[PDB]
Write a protein that binds this ligand. Structure first.
Ligand SMILES: [Cu+]
Ligand SMILES: [Cu+]
Ligand SMILES: [Zn+2]
Ligand SMILES: [Zn+2]
Ligand SMILES: [Zn+2]
Lengths: 204, 204, 204
């Protein structure tokens, strides 16, 4: 009835899936386990991508500091824009020709900020302001369109949430079979699966 | 038995709710769908409020920097207090007479910090310290009580969690009916619902 | 059938657990309630520990700033290293001889940073760089091994997730009994339990 140990006449979610041998059970126990791993991974992997979209700040840091720059506080705003520009260049879409355009455009943005700071370190106020307004040519030229990376990520992350919700429900259904070999298979899968993909984000 | 497609003799959570026509099914499928949307919204909307309580930092930033100020490092602590004071003024309770008192009090706090920095930019140490101690009159006068905004938010967010837990369980029960029209209705609702309220926080 | 109020012939997860008296029901209702409290606590308590591992930044802030220091920008990097060193010393493993070694080692790290800033405030460039390289003796001597605190925490947090997943599933099973006294017991437990452990992190 209610937390049995068995391998006989156990239906599994779909009408075609039924198990009457122990060899069929290990198949079901390996699948339910892998679903439990895939799940806790899915959840982490989905967050990792969400935290990577950092860029949303970097991008708005550059554009908020330019609006702040447009009165010798400019050099500090530009220091904030320099750090933002570097972590932004590291970025890459989720797994090379467009990327080489995007990354090579960011090389300039650093140098242009160094020059407008080289004026501002000497004492030059209005000349760095005009040099800052030349950055708006460059960021528009290369980076502003490749915003595509951002949209692609949210859509990918919607699609992941969808699947994450189904897979959750599926693991509830298998747990509701009340079959301790399956229930354990899931629980142990959730236990280990989390550990492995936890170890992988710590590597990154 | 087990992932059927049907509209005949399907009970739905409560003894009174049973469906024997396809027209009753779409009613059940629209409700289960809307519950799936309302849910993924509830979750996001509940986090949005939690992240808005920022203020808990702004407030403790002001009060930690005053304790830091009470030796020409004061002007920097006051710069941190200026930024804190502005984002704090933007704030508003979850959906005007008390707000106009709260926001108009914050106008002073900015000006008072500008004056105690206008002393500290000229070189005046002990005079800015005494001007800083005049801020403790103002923040107590207007802002310190309206702390109410904070308590109202956590209580609202408790009440949301409560409902969020029930609604979760209800969606599990409907999924457990094993009726593919309902199961899909939920899953598709979770899929889309997330997308819409995801799009709404990106607007904010 | 389907959201009944009853205390007669209600099995509860395990074959041995069955209830036929109202006195047995309150026992089941108190246990299901406490499981609902323990749960929402478990979730919060598990996050609290995760957010405490701050240290992972403090540690990498010190080691990234030393690499940055190895040209009178060093004094600022050292200011960042000073703040990092203090919040790092506060830290403690989850509930005294090793701790007294760890905390007393951090006293030096602050003083050593103050001295290498006392050189850098006077104008001395290369002397503070060599004084910074003396910090690498001290952090290795005491703090770098006690990294143990970090590993102990992730392993503890794996073990918590495991139990958190089981307890979730168990609360689903009791809710699936469709017995309104149990269902309420859980829901009310989740409602209150969250409030109490929410109140406890706000105390910390
Ligand atoms: Cu169920
Ligand atoms: Cu569930
Ligand atoms: Zn998990
Ligand atoms: Zn979700
Ligand atoms: Zn919760």
């Amino acid at each position: 009835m209610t937390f049995y140990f068995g391998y006989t006449n156990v239906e599994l979610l779909f009408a075609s899936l039924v198990i009457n041998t122990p060899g069929e059970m290990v198949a079901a126990c390996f699948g339910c386990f892998l679903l439990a791993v895939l799940y806790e991974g899915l959840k982490i992997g989905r967050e990792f991508l969400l935290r990577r979209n950092d860029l949303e700040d970097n991008w708005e840091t550059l554009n908020d500091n330019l609006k702040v720059i447009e009165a010798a506080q400019v050099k500090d705003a530009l220091t904030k824009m320099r750090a933002a520009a570097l972590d932004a260049q590291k970025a890459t879409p989720p797994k090379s020709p467009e990327m080489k355009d995007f990354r090579h455009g960011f090389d300039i943005l650093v140098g242009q900020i160094d020059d407008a700071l080289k004026l501002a370190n000497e004492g030059k106020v209005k000349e760095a302001q005009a040099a800052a307004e030349q950055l708006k040519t460059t960021r528009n030229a290369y980076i502003q369109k490749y915003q595509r990376m951002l949209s692609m990520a949210h859509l990918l992350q919607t699609v992941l949430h969808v699947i994450q919700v189904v897979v959750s429900y599926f693991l509830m259904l298998v747990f509701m079979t009340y079959n301790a070999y399956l229930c354990m298979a899931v629980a142990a899968g959730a236990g280990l699966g989390y550990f492995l993909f936890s170890w992988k984000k710590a590597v990154v």
